Design a protein around this ligand. Structure first.
Ligand code: WGP
Length: 284
């Protein structure tokens, strides 16, 4: 029974290696990684792999790993797939811990934009969670944390992290993690998966997929929002992604909004992440 080596980048940046039978479905590897992580609330998470073209794709747990990675290496990352709108309702602290690690990467990467003060506040909770109570013996006027807090670090940001860290004395790791999440969950790009697209006139837009619904970022003055209920149907055809928007009360006919994606693979990928978010947040 022939087994393939799998390498998974975990949210703390370490590498987990295991073997699965070469015909294994994605669920087999995902169960092994979740057991390694002692993670029970698995529904929010998934594995990603970088494709030929080098884009992120979700490993479909129901399909063979080999038919997804195809010609590529059996290398994956462990990621949050469904960002919970209210992390206080997750049943375990370890769930909220992995969500924090993902968000820290979202922030450092610049996928999750954040004000100066919110960067410093989030940072201060991570420090409290990881080092415990503020100690001046590891902080002179010239302190720079090992912790990556932002896409661009400044001395002013490091100073503000420490000022806020001083205010958290006696906070336990679970408590600082929950405060981290209460702030992060409110940011306007929290849990937003962004896809490049063109509208039906060829104007460059971004489509965001989130718990609540669908976002079209057009210029800056114009952001359209389609709550999942309002979206009656989606589909893709060639390089095109279409959404069918409910008639308001008293109108005879649904409207169709069409988008042009870079290629057929980008259209299908957007379609599948929309279906999955629609299914997930319709049950939540
Ligand atoms: C900026 N964000 C994340 C939101 O406005 C969430 N809310 C929302 C509501 C309807 C459709 C899509 C999204």
């Amino acid at each position: 029974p022939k087994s393939m080596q799998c390498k998974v980048i975990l949210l703390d940046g370490s590498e987990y290696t295991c073997d699965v039978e070469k015909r294994s479905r994605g669920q087999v590897l995902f169960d092994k990684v979740c057991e390694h992580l002692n993670l029970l609330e698995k529904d929010y998470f998934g594995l990603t792999y970088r494709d030929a073209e080098n884009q992120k794709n979700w490993l479909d747990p129901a399909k063979e790993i080999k038919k997804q990675v195809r010609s590529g290496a059996w290398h994956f990352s462990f990621n949050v797939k469904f960002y919970p709108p209210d992390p206080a309702q997750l049943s375990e602290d370890i769930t909220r811990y992995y969500l924090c690690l993902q968000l820290r990467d979202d922030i450092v990467s610049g996928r999750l934009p954040c004000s100066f003060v919110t960067l410093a506040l989030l940072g201060s909770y991570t420090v409290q969670s990881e080092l415990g109570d503020y100690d001046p013996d590891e902080c002179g006027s010239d302190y720079i944390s090992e912790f990556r807090f932002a896409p661009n670090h400044t001395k002013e940001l490091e100073d503000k992290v420490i000022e806020l860290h001083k205010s958290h004395r006696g906070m336990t790791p679970a408590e600082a993690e929950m405060h981290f999440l209460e702030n992060a969950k409110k940011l306007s790009m929290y849990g937003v998966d962004l896809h490049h697209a063109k509208d039906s006139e060829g104007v460059e837009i971004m489509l965001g997929v989130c718990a609540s619904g669908l976002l079209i970022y057009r210029d800056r003055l114009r952001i359209n929002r389609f709550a999942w209920p309002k979206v009656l149907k989606i589909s893709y055809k060639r390089n095109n992604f279409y959404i069918k928007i409910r008639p308001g009360e008293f109108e005879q006919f649904e409207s169709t909004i069409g988008f042009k994606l870079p290629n057929h693979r980008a259209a299908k990928r957007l379609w599948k992440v929309c279906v999955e978010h629609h299914t997930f947040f319709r049950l939540l």
